[PDB]
């Protein structure tokens, strides 16, 4: 994969992985992780319906010009994987889309992380198990270290933290988990999930003694 990054509102331009040989029919596509891929360019310049004209390609003027996309007005929603499917009169059948240029659009405003904590349910505590989950949402960037505290002391035992991953709002989300048992659950006065974002912290605390 080939790294690249453009700020907001700028004009973006992506070079193809391989190079043209004979006349060409260039296909560009965009992949949002977890989503389905989307076609942007066919026949060098032909844009399908519903595709933003922010995105212009490279027409076939008999060579010279390299296959390249042009994205005027870069947005935050322009973060994805990018494949240039090349086809030409010489090289042959193209089973591969070339390298992946994963674009990261930066310059976004910082969002206060939405943090919330949950206690073990009555149905689960009846199963001789206890677990604490901490969900972080609506924060930029996705640089967070999730921490737990037994009363006032940190705990590294059975710490399962998911990597912060973008939501559909172009803001990261992560889930944290703590393997436990119902006895250690009812043994401490209060447990806290600590979510520090950019030196600032949004911490949530639960207690078994409060409704």
């Amino acid at each position: 994969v080939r790294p690249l990054s453009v700020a907001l509102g700028e004009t973006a331009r992506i070079s193809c992985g391989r190079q043209a040989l004979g006349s060409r029919a260039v296909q560009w596509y965009q992949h949002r992780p977890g989503q389905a891929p989307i076609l942007l360019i066919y026949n060098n310049q032909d844009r399908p319906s519903g595709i933003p004209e922010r995105f212009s390609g490279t027409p076939d003027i008999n060579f010279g010009t390299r296959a390249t996309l042009t994205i005027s007005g870069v947005e935050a929603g322009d973060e994805a994987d990018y494949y240039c499917h090349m086809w030409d009169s010489r090289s042959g059948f193209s089973w591969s889309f070339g390298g992946a240029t994963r674009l990261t659009v930066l310059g976004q405003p910082k969002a206060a992380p939405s943090v919330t904590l949950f206690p073990p349910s009555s149905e689960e505590l009846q199963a001789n198990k206890a677990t604490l989950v901490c969900l972080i949402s609506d924060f930029y960037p996705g640089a967070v270290t999730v921490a737990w505290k037994a009363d006032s002391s940190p705990v590294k035992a059975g710490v399962e933290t998911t990597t912060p991953s973008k939501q559909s709002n172009n803001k990261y989300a992560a889930s944290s988990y703590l393997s436990l048992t119902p006895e250690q659950w009812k043994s401490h006065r209060s447990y806290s999930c600590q979510v520090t974002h950019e030196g600032s912290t949004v911490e949530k605390t639960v207690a078994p003694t409060e409704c």
């Binding site: 029919a25 389905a36 989307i38 066919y42 399908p48 499917h85 086809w87 193209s94």
Partner: peptide
């Protein structure tokens, strides 16, 4: 003096 190329338009959920 031509060639056949395929472009992918409609997609599945994955």
């Amino acid at each position: 003096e031509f060639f056949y190329y395929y472009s992918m338009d409609v997609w599945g959920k994955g």
